[PDB]
Structure 1
């Protein structure tokens, strides 16, 4: 669910805890935009054929 995110070691009787994400919003926001860009280029190329 990623409530705290960790890994449970059943081989040793311990629970490995990771804490305070270094995950940044800058990166996450950037991912949405870049997928929309790939779409625009496809539409552009189709129009490109006329010019040639």
Structure 2
């Protein structure tokens, strides 16, 4: 059920220690990574227009 991600937790065999944690700011790295991936096509297309107009 942790592999199913129904709640926050993780098991243990050697020590049996239970740890519960979460990462609230999920909407930051998604929008940032999408801006990087979308801007890659912008810079590459710019290099296509300039590479086309030069050589």
Q: TM-score, normalised by structure 2?
A: 0.38
RMSD of aligned alpha carbons: 3.6
TM-score (norm 1): 0.39
Segments of 5+ residues of structure 2 without an aligned counterpart are: none
Structure 1 stretches of 5 or more lacking a match? none
- Give the total of aligned pairs: 52
**Structure 1 pair 26–19 and aligned structure 2 pair: CA distance change class (3 A):** closer
Post-superposition offset of 1:29: 5.8
More displaced, 10-19 or 31-40?
A: 31-40
